[PDB]
């Protein structure tokens, strides 16, 4: 069975979606620890704009705090509370 | 409230998730056309394995067919049935 064009368009247009984000990318400067899990489920802006001059970006953000295992390899481990960015509303905007 | 570690671990482990995939990356050879929408929602393997020698990969695949607008700039447009890969089951596997 075939997905109709207006359904595809609509499901794929710029909106907040559950995205699995590598933690090291949210904390690029971290040089002490590796993380377990190495990625977290965040509501984030995804999808497309139909428009090579527009990009899908957040208008309304919030924080969420998670417990993440932090391992300093060959030294030890603990669990730390970590803060991440989440996107509540997305709009398509000039670059 | 804080997301508990065992909830984060579980939600983030390697599984099929709805992912927005740019069409030009599924059809790297098709420079002739622009696509509208430029990306499609596909069930794909995401999340983490928590072992740098394991990676999240598909064990069971299927096709899905979607109608995509294809524009050949300054020539015309039509709607074409296009086929994509989808992931039904994901496992963590040696790399």
């Amino acid at each position, epitope marked *: 069975e075939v997905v109709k064009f207006m359904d595809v368009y609509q499901r794929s247009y710029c909106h907040p979606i559950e995205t699995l984000v590598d933690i090291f990318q949210e904390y690029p400067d971290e040089i002490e620890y590796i993380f377990k899990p190495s990625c977290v489920p965040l509501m984030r802006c995804g999808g497309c704009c139909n428009d090579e001059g527009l990009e899908c970006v957040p208008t309304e953000e919030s924080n969420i705090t998670m*417990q993440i295992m932090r391992i300093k390899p060959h030294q030890g481990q*603990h669990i730390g509370e970590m803060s991440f960015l989440q996107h509540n509303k997305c709009e398509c905007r000039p670059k | 409230e804080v997301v508990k570690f065992m909830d984060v671990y579980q939600r983030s482990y390697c599984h099929p998730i709805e992912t927005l995939v740019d069409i030009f990356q599924e059809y790297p050879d098709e420079i002739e056309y622009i696509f509208k929408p430029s990306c499609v929602p596909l069930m794909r393997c995401g999340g983490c394995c928590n072992d740098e020698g394991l990676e999240c990969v598909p064990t069971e695949e299927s096709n899905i067919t979607m109608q995509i607008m294809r524009i050949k700039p300054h020539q015309g447009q039509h709607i074409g049935e296009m086929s994509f890969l989808q992931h039904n089951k994901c496992e963590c596997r040696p790399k």
Partner: antibody
Amino acid sequence: EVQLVESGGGLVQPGGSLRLSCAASGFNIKDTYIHWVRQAPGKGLEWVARIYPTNGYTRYADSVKGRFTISADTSKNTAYLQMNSLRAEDTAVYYCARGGSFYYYYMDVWGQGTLVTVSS
Amino acid sequence: DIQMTQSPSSLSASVGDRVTITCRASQDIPRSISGYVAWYQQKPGKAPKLLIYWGSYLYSGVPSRFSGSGSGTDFTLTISSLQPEDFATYYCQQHYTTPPTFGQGTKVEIKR
């Protein structure tokens, strides 16, 4: 069933040497850390050493540094503690223990222990 | 080098009592941080046995009367309903850092 069995303890004179063994079954020591931990008579637990068998990475307590050496033979699935230059204070039951995995720093399986008596 | 201070050093409690044992890290660690302590039970002439790991997780096969909690510097092992077979010395361990270190122990005697 996962197990560790130490051997090699005994009486040894001050200044002497002794080597202990720890044989694993039901898992491969390749996949985790193996520790030695000791217990002087009537006292508490004192970590002495740890090995990551694959690459052979080792760490020691200060109280045995330069005197004890920890090693693992992955083909025999056996770990060892070579103890040199022994003093009366080294007297203790010596335990072998594994940490569940490279990502686990707790010790979930311990052997039965082997007594080392350092006396003239 | 983190020292763990365990308390009490000994106690006497009755069958069925809720027993609480405490461990404190010598280094200042914030309350956002948890899960770096394991608890062990040692019976006479026996090896230690893991009860609780990552601060609060019950190890496979351990009776559910055992639990643990804590954050920052302060950890607790709780025996919700003390049994005769719970006579032992209980040790905490930190693995925030290496060398891993053990508290000095707590001797639990059963009052009968």
